[PDB]
Design a protein around this ligand. Structure first.
Ligand SMILES: [Zn+2]
Ligand SMILES: [Zn+2]
Lengths: 263, 263
């Protein structure tokens, strides 16, 4: 957790800097020059990390695709998959007692409310989920993420089964990232910074728009798909929510579903 | 900020899991199997990031070496370096008034107390610095870091000029990292985890050991060089301090020196 003072006079060590002899002051300005050269090299490092993310996203894809098929009930688990304990840290007696706690229900297909439960177990995303959002999020069949190089950034895709709230099958949110130091504040470069977020138009069915109420803006998770010193921090909170989904929830969804992982 | 429940029965959604029909329960165990495959692929990603860090550490080295030469007074700034503003966000009047606030002092060599000031402006490291540590840290000429692949991990090196407190020129702290998921808790893999920290023997001069007091353990930053549910969290705090130095302070030292960056 860092903080940049965009104005020099407000620095915490300003009195010390001001009292430095001009001799010493010019050495500090040389270090500011050197610091920019460090920043430019750091920028190339982060671009290489971003490319590495793209390479491993293709490697990740099949295991996420198999997760979706299981959640949707399109494939049934193999016996190796059934042999994996549902929870960690149990005993054989505790595990056997768990499996004997509820007989099979052939009418239950897939894993109902998987992504709703996983999202609601992350404390940041759960606070954005209102009650009128809950029955819509139960149609979530998948949540995916992929990074891009041409427009630099990443996107998050929310895949919805056919539902009476909107016609969209995939709701996409895109963040455009800047990987270069910005000419207006080059020494503040901390890595890829969000330039702007782009949402998606939801084709609501009549009377189902949970983002509006009687008409004024209503509190809804689905305002996530209409993105905008207050506007700068508003984009920061929106970007942090997107990061929680891409970096934390998506790769470890089942751990949030069981509640073994909390964040 | 995450939290793993190493015991399944303590999960926040345990009651929901327990009540799932065995039919649905076996699908969740398939997802635990798939989650491990995701983790194994993530492990290879982090190894590739670590190798990328090693590649760019060689690229970073010359700008850090030039910083050390300026801090030590071995080279004087060029006119391009002098043309870089000492602080960001000023005016030409404010910048000119800053440079006129103290005439040159030819007896002042380099930048005195550069690394002491930078470390003390980071709030985590400053809390570990006692007053008897301050005159020792003024002999700090450089603080460097480098990652390793053969023993996987990284080290931090504290370079000290000849001083009356100890004979060591370089004090090294090494962290050994594990990049594979651990067989005792594989689903808890969050990336490279610290296995153990290795410090360094300080050859104190007589009566100068600030880590001892009248004899019992004294509070001193230099206990950082004698590393060890309490011992696990003790290594975590020691590792977080090493991370603050490697990841935050070292790459942006001059910004902590001026106080334009706070963390
Ligand atoms: Zn990226
Ligand atoms: Zn590394």
């Amino acid at each position: 957790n860092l903080y940049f003072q965009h104005m020099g006079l407000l620095s915490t060590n300003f009195d010390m800097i001001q009292a430095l002899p001009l001799n010493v002051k010019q050495r500090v300005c040389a270090l500011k020059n050197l610091q920019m050269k460090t920043i430019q090299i750091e920028s190339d490092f982060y671009k290489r990390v971003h490319e590495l993310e793209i390479e491993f996203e293709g490697k990740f894809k099949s295991t996420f695709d198999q997760r979706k098929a299981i959640v949707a009930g399109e494939v049934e688990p193999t016996k190796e998959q059934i042999d994996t304990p549902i929870l960690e840290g149990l005993e054989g007696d505790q595990l056997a007692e768990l499996y004997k706690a509820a007989e099979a229900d052939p009418s239950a297909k897939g894993i109902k409310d998987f992504w709703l439960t996983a999202l609601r177990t992350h404390d940041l995303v759960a606070e954005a989920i209102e009650e009128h959002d809950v029955p819509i999020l139960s149609y979530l069949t998948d949540v995916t993420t992929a990074a891009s190089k041409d427009p630099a950034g990443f996107k998050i895709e929310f895949h919805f089964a056919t539902n009476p709230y909107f016609k969209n099958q995939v709701l996409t949110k895109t963040y455009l990232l800047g990987f270069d130091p910005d000419a207006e504040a080059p020494l503040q470069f901390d890595g890829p910074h969000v330039i702007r977020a782009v949402g998606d138009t939801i084709e609501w069915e009549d009377g189902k728009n949970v983002t509006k109420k009687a008409t004024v803006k209503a509190d809804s998770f689905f305002n996530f798909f209409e993105p905008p010193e207050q506007a700068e921090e508003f984009l920061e909170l929106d970007y942090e929510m997107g990061q929680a989904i891409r970096d934390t929830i998506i790769p470890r969804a089942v751990l949030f579903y069981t509640g073994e992982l909390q964040s």
